[PDB]
């Protein structure tokens, strides 16, 4: 299940954004990597109600629809 | 020995027109991605196997269309209203096996 990650990594330039976007709606972030901070953060699911899923999407299509999609049609 | 054939390639006036194609061949396509790139080297478009799930480059969007020919050995780039800052090489791709490419030249 981590193919996907690193694809929405790549698919998106600014990490920092859907993390501005996901500010308090969160330590992570002493991990290195640009991408650490994006594999781990799909390792908080259990924290993520659905409103949070609702979040990350909404802000992608929000950001670039195309993208909401792949990871809906996935 | 892998092969990849870029064409379609050529000089146009913005607003108009640019087919580009490339031909695969020597191994099973259909079970990988292809794609197009111009030269950085910034990505272009992005087709994954089976058709699916399409990926175009934000300069792409609404205009560029990548295609897919499975039956078999052809990829389709699709360029309207041509712009000379997107007059490039395109380079078609998979695999780690990139196309020698085409020259595009747009004024």
């Known amino acids: 299940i981590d193919q996907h990650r690193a694809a929405l990594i790549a698919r998106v330039t600014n990490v920092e954004?859907?993390?501005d976007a996901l500010y308090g709606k969160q330590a992570v972030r002493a991990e290195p990597?640009?991408?650490?901070?994006?594999?781990?953060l799909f390792s908080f699911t259990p924290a993520w109600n659905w409103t949070?899923?609702?979040?990350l999407?909404?802000?992608?299509?929000?950001?670039?629809?195309?993208?909401v999609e792949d990871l809906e049609r996935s | 020995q892998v092969q990849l054939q870029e064409?379609?390639?050529?000089?146009?006036?913005?607003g108009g027109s640019l087919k580009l194609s490339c031909a695969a061949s020597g191994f099973t396509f259909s079970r990988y991605a292809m794609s197009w790139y111009r030269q950085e080297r910034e990505s272009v478009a992005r087709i994954s196997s089976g058709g699916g799930t399409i990926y175009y480059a934000d300069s792409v969007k609404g205009r560029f269309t990548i295609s897919r020919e499975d039956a078999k050995n052809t990829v389709?780039?699709?360029?309207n209203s041509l712009k000379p800052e997107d007059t490039a090489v395109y380079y078609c791709y998979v695999?780690?096996?990139w196309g020698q490419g085409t020259q595009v030249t747009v004024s």
């Open chain 1, 52 to 55: 949070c899923k609702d979040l």
């Open chain 1, 33 to 40: 990597t640009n991408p650490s901070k994006m594999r781990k």
């Open chain 1, 17 to 19: 954004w859907l993390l």
């Open chain 2, 76 to 79: 389709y780039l699709q360029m």
């Open chain 2, 95 to 97: 695999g780690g096996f």
């Open chain 2, 7 to 14: 064409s379609g390639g050529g000089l146009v006036q913005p």
């Open chain 1, 57 to 67: 999407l909404q802000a992608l299509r929000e950001s670039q629809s195309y993208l």
